[PDB]
């Protein structure tokens, strides 16, 4: 494989090394596969920015640009969920 460069190895030696590390971080979470919550199978992928879809059972939900959830979405999804229990 490659020691330090990973999925950013398609860029050769262009653009500078700080900018190729920003590409590598966001590209791993964007092209990964996630487990569905309705059917429980590992078949969720991204369609466009903010649209994630399951290839089996076809269900669509809304998330982040490059990751399925965002750090400020998790914070407020809990508050609504603690407020109902208490």
């Amino acid at each position: 494989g490659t020691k330090k460069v990973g999925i950013a190895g398609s860029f050769g030696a262009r653009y500078g090394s700080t900018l190729r590390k920003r590409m590598k971080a966001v590209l791993e979470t964007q092209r990964a596969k996630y487990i569905c919550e309705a059917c429980g199978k590992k078949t969720v992928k991204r369609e466009a920015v903010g649209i994630w879809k399951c290839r089996s059972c076809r269900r669509v939900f809304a998330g982040g640009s490059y990751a399925k959830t965002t750090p400020a979405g998790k914070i407020f999804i809990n508050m609504v969920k603690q407020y109902n229990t208490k």
Binding site: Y15, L19, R22, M23, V26, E47, A48, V49, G50, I51, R59, V60, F61, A62, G63, G64, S65, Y66, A67, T69, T70, A72, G73, F76, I77, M79, V80, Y83, N84
Partner: protein, 232 residues
Amino acid sequence: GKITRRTREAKKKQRQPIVKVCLSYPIIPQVEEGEVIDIVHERSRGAPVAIISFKEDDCMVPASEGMYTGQKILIGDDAPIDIGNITKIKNVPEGMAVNSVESVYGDGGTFAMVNGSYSLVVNHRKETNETVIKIPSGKKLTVSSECRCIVGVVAGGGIHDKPLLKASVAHYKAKARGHVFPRVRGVAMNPVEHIHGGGNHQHVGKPTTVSKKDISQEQKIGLVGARRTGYR
């Protein structure tokens, strides 16, 4: 001289406009039940749009982070608190994030409608029926306690996490949205087209802060009405 680039780009856009679809929700005082029938992408926007269906009316809104097709939401003044759920802004505790807040009770939405944004509820001044909120820019603003909102953040996350990195990516973005691309610097033109001009070296040649009050329109190019310049 001849007419400057800023003024012609404004005339080109009244001839051939960029159009967005105007999201908004209707007026329904009794607690009904909706149905998300689709979440879809739109040209010139970064946020996805949800199609929600009521008993006698459909609407287009900005989808919140945590929606899915076939989910049921409630609309009405006294509705319970949950992601989605158009409700009135006095039934919302402090510290809670909302989006698409209106200001006149019936205008749809006004505030916090772009990719990954929200407003904060800070105080309920129960006398006078006033609510202090924080809008996305930082300004604080008191609205009545009867305006409605949506619970949660707008979907579409942090779009600036990924650099543009290449000329062609900035080319496709400016085609969809209508920015000036490419930009020639004003100091590289001849004097006939720009207040920054010729000269045997490239240099502006006079102060780049200009007034915002009393001068000719077509003189307002550069840093207009600036309070302060510099790095920090």
